[PDB]
Write a protein that binds this ligand. Structure first.
Ligand SMILES: Cc1cc2nc3c(=O)[nH]c(=O)nc-3n(C[C@H](O)[C@H](O)[C@H](O)COP(=O)(O)O)c2cc1C
Length: 169
C-alpha cells in the first residue's frame, strides 16, 4: 500500500485504533498494518507516507516494542517522508506524562529529516504536561480509551479526513 502504519501495543488498545485508522482510509489496499514487534527498522524505508502509533507506558516511557527498535531508527533516511502519529494514553491517571511516547518518537523521527503532518488540538483534553505538545498543539492524534472512549470514533474519522489531504488522497 502507499501508506505504512507501524504500531506497538501492550494491552491491545493501540492495535484496535490502528485497525480503525486502516478502515477509515479504505482498507488493506490503502494502508498496510505492521506490528513494530515483528519489523526491522529498514521496513520503514519502503514507504513515502508513514503513520506511527505508540501508547505511553510506565509514566512517560515508550511501549516496549518501540523501545527496542528506537536506536535502530538512525539507520533509516526519513528525508522526504511525510509522517503522522497517534497514541493511546490516560490523561487523568498520568496528567504530567500524557502521550509522552508519541512526542519522544516524533522528536526522533523528525530530527532524521521527515515532515510531520496531522497536528491535533489540545483543547479537548485535560492534562498538565505532555512531550507531544509543540506550540499548543499535539503532534498527532491523542486517543484516551480509559477516560474518553465515546470520542474515539469521531476523533479517528476527523483525523483521517485531515490526513487524506496531506497524503494526496
Ligand atoms: C502501568 C501503566 C502506566 C501508564 N503510563 C502512562 C503514561 O505515562 N502516560 C499516559 O498517557 N498513559 C499511561 N498509561 C495509559 C496507557 O497508555 C493506556 O491504557 C493505553 O490505552 C494502553 O495502550 P495499549 O493497549 O496499546 O498498550 C499507563 C497505563 C498503565 C497500565
Amino acid at each position: 500500500a502507499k501508506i505504512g502504519l507501524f504500531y506497538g501495543t501492550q494491552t491491545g488498545v493501540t492495535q484496535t485504533i490502528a485497525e480503525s485508522i486502516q478502515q477509515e482510509f479504505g482498507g488493506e489496499s490503502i494502508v498496510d498494518l505492521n506490528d513494530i514487534a515483528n519489523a526491522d527498522a529498514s521496513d520503514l524505508n519502503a514507504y513515502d507516507y508513514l503513520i506511527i502509533g505508540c501508547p505511553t507506558w510506565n509514566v512517560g516511557e515508550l511501549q516496549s516494542d518501540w523501545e527496542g527498535i528506537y536506536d535502530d531508527l538512525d539507520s533509516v533516511n526519513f528525508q522526504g517522508k511525510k509522517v503522522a502519529y497517534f497514541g493511546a494514553g490516560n490523561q487523568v491517571g498520568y496528567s504530567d506524562n500524557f502521550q509522552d511516547a508519541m512526542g519522544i518518537l516524533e522528536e526522533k523521527i523528525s530530527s532524521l529529516g521527515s515532515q510531520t503532518v496531522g497536528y491535533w488540538p489540545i483543547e479537548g483534553y485535560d492534562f498538565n504536561e505532555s512531550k507531544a505538545v509543540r506550540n499548543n498543539q499535539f503532534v498527532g492524534l491523542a486517543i484516551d480509551e480509559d477516560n474518553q472512549p465515546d470520542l474515539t470514533k469521531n476523533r479517528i474519522k476527523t483525523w483521517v479526513s485531515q490526513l487524506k489531504s496531506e497524503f494526496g488522497l
